[PDB]
Design an enzyme around this catalytic site. Sequence first.
Site, PDB file in Angstrom:
ATOM      1  N   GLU F 103       3.590   0.804  13.459  1.00 55.10           N
ATOM      2  CA  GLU F 103       3.622   1.605  12.222  1.00 55.10           C
ATOM      3  C   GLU F 103       5.059   2.080  12.021  1.00 55.10           C
ATOM      4  O   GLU F 103       5.582   1.909  10.945  1.00 55.10           O
ATOM      5  CB  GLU F 103       2.673   2.794  12.356  1.00 55.10           C
ATOM      6  CG  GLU F 103       1.258   2.414  12.739  1.00 55.10           C
ATOM      7  CD  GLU F 103       0.578   1.585  11.675  1.00 55.10           C
ATOM      8  OE1 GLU F 103       1.221   1.337  10.700  1.00 55.10           O
ATOM      9  OE2 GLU F 103      -0.575   1.217  11.834  1.00 55.10           O
ATOM     10  N   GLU F 133       4.019   3.380   5.955  1.00 59.62           N
ATOM     11  CA  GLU F 133       4.182   3.241   7.399  1.00 59.62           C
ATOM     12  C   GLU F 133       4.595   4.564   8.029  1.00 59.62           C
ATOM     13  O   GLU F 133       4.293   4.822   9.208  1.00 59.62           O
ATOM     14  CB  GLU F 133       5.175   2.106   7.705  1.00 59.62           C
ATOM     15  CG  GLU F 133       4.780   0.753   7.031  1.00 59.62           C
ATOM     16  CD  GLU F 133       3.404   0.181   7.472  1.00 59.62           C
ATOM     17  OE1 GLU F 133       3.132  -0.983   7.100  1.00 59.62           O
ATOM     18  OE2 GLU F 133       2.589   0.861   8.174  1.00 59.62           O
ATOM     19  N   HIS F 136       1.272   6.175   8.443  1.00 55.00           N
ATOM     20  CA  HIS F 136       0.509   5.637   9.563  1.00 55.00           C
ATOM     21  C   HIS F 136       1.086   6.033  10.908  1.00 55.00           C
ATOM     22  O   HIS F 136       0.329   6.169  11.877  1.00 55.00           O
ATOM     23  CB  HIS F 136       0.475   4.123   9.463  1.00 55.00           C
ATOM     24  CG  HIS F 136      -0.170   3.644   8.232  1.00 55.00           C
ATOM     25  ND1 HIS F 136      -0.204   2.314   7.879  1.00 55.00           N
ATOM     26  CD2 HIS F 136      -0.828   4.318   7.254  1.00 55.00           C
ATOM     27  CE1 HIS F 136      -0.863   2.187   6.740  1.00 55.00           C
ATOM     28  NE2 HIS F 136      -1.226   3.391   6.332  1.00 55.00           N
ATOM     29  N   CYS F 140      -1.496   7.762  13.571  1.00 52.82           N
ATOM     30  CA  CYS F 140      -1.708   7.392  14.972  1.00 52.82           C
ATOM     31  C   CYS F 140      -1.383   8.558  15.890  1.00 52.82           C
ATOM     32  O   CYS F 140      -2.078   8.805  16.888  1.00 52.82           O
ATOM     33  CB  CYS F 140      -0.821   6.192  15.343  1.00 52.82           C
ATOM     34  SG  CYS F 140      -1.420   4.627  14.711  1.00 52.82           S
TER      35      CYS F 140
END
EC number: 1.14.13.25
Lengths: 136, 136, 389, 389, 515, 140, 167
Positions: F103, F133, F136, F140
């Site tokens: 990511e 990204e 993301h 995560c």
Amino acid sequence: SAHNAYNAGIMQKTGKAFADEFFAEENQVVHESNAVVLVLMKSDEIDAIIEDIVLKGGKAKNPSIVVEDKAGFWWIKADGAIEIDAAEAGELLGKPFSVYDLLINVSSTVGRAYTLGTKFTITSELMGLDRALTDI
Amino acid sequence: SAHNAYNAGIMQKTGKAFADEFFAEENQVVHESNAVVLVLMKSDEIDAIIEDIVLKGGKAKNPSIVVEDKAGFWWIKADGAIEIDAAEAGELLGKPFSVYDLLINVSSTVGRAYTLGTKFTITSELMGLDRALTDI
Amino acid sequence: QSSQVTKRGLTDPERAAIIAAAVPDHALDTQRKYHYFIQPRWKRLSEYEQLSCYAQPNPDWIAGGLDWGDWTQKFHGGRPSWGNESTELRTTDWYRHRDPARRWHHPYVKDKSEEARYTQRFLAAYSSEGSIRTIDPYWRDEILNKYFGALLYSEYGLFNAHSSVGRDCLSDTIRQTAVFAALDKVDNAQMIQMERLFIAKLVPGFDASTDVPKKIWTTDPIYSGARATVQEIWQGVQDWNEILWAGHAVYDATFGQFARREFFQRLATVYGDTLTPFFTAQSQTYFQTTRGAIDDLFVYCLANDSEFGAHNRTFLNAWTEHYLASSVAALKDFVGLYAKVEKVAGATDRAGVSEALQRVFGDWKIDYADKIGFRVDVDQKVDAVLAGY
Amino acid sequence: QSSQVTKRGLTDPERAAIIAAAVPDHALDTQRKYHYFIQPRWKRLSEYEQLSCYAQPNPDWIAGGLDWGDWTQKFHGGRPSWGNESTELRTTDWYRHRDPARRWHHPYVKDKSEEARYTQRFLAAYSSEGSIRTIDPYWRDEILNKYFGALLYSEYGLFNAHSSVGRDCLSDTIRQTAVFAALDKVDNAQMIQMERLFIAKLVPGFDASTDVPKKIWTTDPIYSGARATVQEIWQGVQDWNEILWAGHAVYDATFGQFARREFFQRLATVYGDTLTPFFTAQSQTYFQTTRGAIDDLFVYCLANDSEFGAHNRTFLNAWTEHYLASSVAALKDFVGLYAKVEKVAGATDRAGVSEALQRVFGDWKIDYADKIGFRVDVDQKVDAVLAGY
Amino acid sequence: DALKVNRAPVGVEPQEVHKWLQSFNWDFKENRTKYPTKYHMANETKEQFKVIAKEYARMEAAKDERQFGTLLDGLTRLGAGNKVHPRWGETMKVISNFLEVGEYNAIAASAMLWDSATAAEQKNGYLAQVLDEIRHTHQCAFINHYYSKHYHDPAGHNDARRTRAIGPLWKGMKRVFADGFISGDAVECSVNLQLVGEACFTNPLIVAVTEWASANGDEITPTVFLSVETDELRHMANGYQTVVSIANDPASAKFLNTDLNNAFWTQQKYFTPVLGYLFEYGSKFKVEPWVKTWNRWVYEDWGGIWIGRLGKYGVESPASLRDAKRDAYWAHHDLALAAYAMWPLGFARLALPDEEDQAWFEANYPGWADHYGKIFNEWKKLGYEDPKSGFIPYQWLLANGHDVYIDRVSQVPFIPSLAKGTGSLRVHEFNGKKHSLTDDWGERQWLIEPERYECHNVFEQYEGRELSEVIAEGHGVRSDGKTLIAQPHTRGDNLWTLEDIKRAGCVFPDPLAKF
Amino acid sequence: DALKVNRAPVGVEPQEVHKWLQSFNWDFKENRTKYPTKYHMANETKEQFKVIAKEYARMEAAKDERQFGTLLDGLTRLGAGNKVHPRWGETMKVISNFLEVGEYNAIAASAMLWDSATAAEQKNGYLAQVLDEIRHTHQC
Amino acid sequence: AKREPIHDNSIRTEWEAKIAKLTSVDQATKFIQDFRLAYTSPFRKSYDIDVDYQYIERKIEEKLSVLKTEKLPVADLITKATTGEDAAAVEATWIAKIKAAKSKYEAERIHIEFRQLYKPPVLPVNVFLRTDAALGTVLMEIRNTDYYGTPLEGLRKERGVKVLHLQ
Ligand SMILES: [Fe+3]
Ligand SMILES: [Fe+3]
Ligand SMILES: [Fe+3]
């Protein structure tokens, strides 16, 4: 229709039967497919769209659609193209719903997907190469 | 401390023993209490406040605090007053946290509760009658 | 802990198994549309209509009610909890109103929260920019601080006029329209005071206290007609339809729109005020959202009710006559403020003020007067106001 | 359906019982603070630092990295995935930067979404208000449409200058600062075009196409110095520190702030433009948020790095010399626009423009020049620009 | 000047604005409430929560996003809407739609209080409550809307704003949580709504119920109700501030304790039996005995912390408290007899207590088995659940002399021959009309204030009509036009239809004809 | 004029702005990618999702509110975080932190592609990915 | 008795026929006052149409209100009762009557009768609501004074009920 099931074809075999077909020489190159795969994340709005758009009007216009329950998401495979109009989803739900709101719970596309107006389309066609993208 | 348990006193009796105390003549008028009851809705932020503020610093300053797990919420009873500083909660959580954000998951108050600055206070005192409310 | 820790039926293996055995394998009805019997105003039932309509438990003797019998408890003397005695207007169905913005509580606070947080970000940047430096200090300390500050009392008075409306009115969609309109008015008052407090942090010795604005509101001849109309609309009547109509469709649509848009907002953009238009952007947005709902209630519905439209226009025209006179009077006092500002051609000269009044009154005639059959001569009202110029 | 319907371990009685038997009755460690070893900039670790810091997998041979060894795959020829060869500046730790607004992705889009939705509500009300009627039509069709429209190309060029920055820069907090700064610049360009499209719906025959603005940007002498600086900052260099510093701390802080705030926003509030200040309220808010982060990176950190501060100021002062000259040139062309507007004393006369330039350059000296030791004579830069008046 | 200014970033925080609110009001001779009241609220009253309009919205929208996230995203993906025990999913038809009318009428009541107050800060506290009660109307609606979409029986979740009008329990809810909040002295309404309704009875109704919901598989209701009560606590402060604002009014010494005792009895008369009935009989898994819940929340905590502490300012322990305690122990079992006997007039499906419920009742209320349990088991043997039985227990009560009366004041049913809770039948004729009253406190209210209490009861409206025609006219049917919404069991087969009701031959009598 | 104008309520929808994006780029001889490549991306390429910056934020913030609602409110109240089989809760240490680096690096990769493209619409599609990204990485 | 349906029945239909024959403000005012004296409040003369009178009353008000707007000058709508009396004079009169009342039983009868005679559309809404609030304030102060003083046996005799049963 049954060709679009998650477990279609080789996927029904187990054990040695699976292996022999998986390693058959015909299956060492890709085979072009006219299918599209659409993944919808489960939610209140999506579950209504599934039941009252995809599985009614949608399957009527495209009898090849198969919908499978994968616990957290809906797995959908069809021949050719799937189309969802956000303006029809909004009427069903009773609240403002643009194409961008529809995208809140569209989780994957195996195919050429695009937005035009209120419509979300996922198609086997090679957009931008075989057919041009347009503005509103 | 044990006087502030949810099941304190008469609540431990069952059957006829409960009934006889419930209908005793001493118990047909209210009995003034110096307690406050605070109910916190369970959430990520509240569960950290419970463990690292209420059950550490809070109980140190007020050993009468009892916290009970009621599945969806925390039931808290103490003598006198309970105080929670939103500015301390924000440091513990690592994100902006005003007194109004603290109120997002404060679900009930049996007592006089008020906001002043970053502080939320629930007190046995008769605010506005015995002690005046102030501005910042 | 002293009490049992209750096992959840959703996740406890034993309780979930017992619950699973008791749930039938099929639905017991197929109608899943909540309050499917509401008549939709638009193509399909909206969530706004589903969550709002018929929450008010009116009996059949209040037009549109689905329940029956008398109330369980009335006032001493017999006044009913809700009753037809609350207003002169009549209708075949009090539940017929729809806010065109379809605001139930959640979209309402969602939108105002966006404005809440963005305002603080804009103020922090505006202070860092130093843009206050280009504001005419006479406009700032004399017109803005004192006379804009006094306008908060008009907004606050119109807010308070809604207290009896919120108690007395006769259906759920009308009540939501009225309460949201009330909060937006008190929001306007608090925002004007927010602006003054903001300027006080940037300009030393700027006095943001309300003392002077309050004295101006209560004793300055410039606001005397406005204060009198607002005191009347708020505390002089209790017909809840009269209050909403007089408050929003006459007074606020004429005096209010002139003071906010044609005076304070428009002239901010001749004296180099880059701050005030951020706040009037909000009050004017709130005005147009409120107008959509008032229009539906009075213009689209009550003035055309199949049985009572002409009956209702009789009262609406009478009210309009009376409150428009009060508002003209209020504007005639107000335009005296122009003697206190620098004369800019096409803005603060007689031709400028005359064009501004033609805009307010001409808009009001299209938006409201034409639609209830009220006859008005715009030019004649412009001249009556200029008499005070 | 062809495949098994998977039973959930959270709610299925059998699977939940098996899972419950396998979970220990006690924790296996007590350290529950995610990436507890980050050094906090403020009193306690913030969520912004926890979610951002050390996501970049730098090895120990890039200052501050926690990993080791060479990259797994490099460019043909040997250029590393990230490397010290990407910039002249040096530091003991590339992870030391903190955005003072602490924006990770969620607060960033949360705030811009508020502005997104409120903007559409403001436009719908502004159209209903009819407030366009009071805008000077010469300012509208001549200055606004053509020259404000051309300014979108400056914003768009500064946006594109960030493409190589986003690829090349050397830590996670710097990369977030740069990407958010880039999106806000292209937001500014799209908002200017949104305003023009909005005016086109209200004023028949208003041409909102970009054809004329683009011709003005590319060929009108008024923008010739600006276009040249932006083309240079974008495509003439690749040192990612040089691009951020030249783009935001010199060019945008001098020419950009003059064009947006001192020209288009300030003069909107002399020609009766009630619409444009709503949009410049956004660009100026975005400018001040971006400035807080650029200031931390360059002024607070790199110019004072314990080992490389003086080394770094050597490059910063050189860059500033070169790009400030370009920006002065750009402003000298730009002030020719004043010949096209009506002369208002203290605003568009020489004294007015001179005071506006004293504000931009004097602010820039306090905000930036003083803090890196750059010596500048404000009066001398004001006079150089007035040469074009 | 035009070159120098301080450029530090500053805003304006909500409490800075709130400080100036008190000065927003202004004096003119017509500035007084429009509503009848014996009291005068002090001009200088301050409020406990410093809320302005912008921060109100910011706070409430953040509560909403988390709640609608949990409901529309997480719990929908888990299928939670159909993981509830049927008894409890039926009970929530009643709990959420009945609470809805209280949420709705509280909008109007708080607006009336906003009118009564003179202090701008006090107006502001009532104003925030006006907005909250709109929020809560829509939240209760959303529970039933969510259940209509996701639970195996949407009938009754999907149409209660009209199907509630058929039955007798709805009438009593209108008295405590509708008319009681808005009809009377503004201060009488304030004690009914805020000091008793909200500060006392919503703790069991809204907070404590969520544990019963969770025990029975319902995670929808806790998500919403626990968020509802975050606003409710600011309304408890409003009620207290009412008392503060009249504390120096000599009228309070004359009147307050009478208004307080009337309101306390009004609220408890319905909620004490109805909540205990819905908790204990409308659940499979029980959390604790209702009388213990009442003891903890009503008698000890609310009574001690609110009423007890106010003793120093003249507030007395309510004279009706002793009668309320008898109700807390038995009256919900009394009401169960009436609710099960008149099941076809409802909009929810019920279940008789099973063998393990009965063991629990007897253990916690010794004597239950010999009184109530004997009756329920007889009805079961007579065919209570079986649509071919032709048996409806209301006529069995009549055949055995166990007539049901409706209190003219409270609308609560009463079965004097079977009741173990407080009360006794009084039947008066006045000016050609007969009236049944059931306790000393309500009889006094009717005798002193008969023009307040003229509410038609179901026997007056339905006299001489056959059950099935009343149900059909009220739309008490599912979408096939013939199967009843209400049922005497929670199973998925053998549902009763209009023809099965008609076979029983049940006609409404006039219960006072014999007097 | 200064008295008459159409006063119907109108806004500007995202696809109306997006239509003009292609014309935001302009030609100068130094306008070419900085990165080594064997290929040349066509100037007229269009993108499949018509996203502008304001609608990007509106769409992503709505995804976030529902997700953080489920996590911080509903699943926390249910105690879901410790109802996972230990093998799987261990596996997620690896899956989520390893995915995180993908990511993160995808932020830089998409920015490099944004540099490579000549068509403004194509730049815009890579630009949206640059922002995703970051989202993301933080997810995560 | 055997009731007819709730919302549509022969009693309501018959009274709607009578109401449709009212043709003048004078006639409708007498009609609605006689109706309210006959069929409303605990002192009504007949409970015969108890479950229908409130709906019927609404229909009479609708007819009287329309007749008012068709036949009266606008100023009369604002300042006069349909009896022809001055609205402000009705207001002053009835507040004086209630403040001269010596028991709660006299006060209660004055308030109830004022509503029976002057409920809108007879009196203008603004004047009526203001008067009714003033009357109710007096009624409450009287009634709520020493509320628990008289025992039930005493209240029963003061009120005049015929006690048919006491358990
Ligand atoms: Fe509520
Ligand atoms: Fe409440
Ligand atoms: Fe990704």
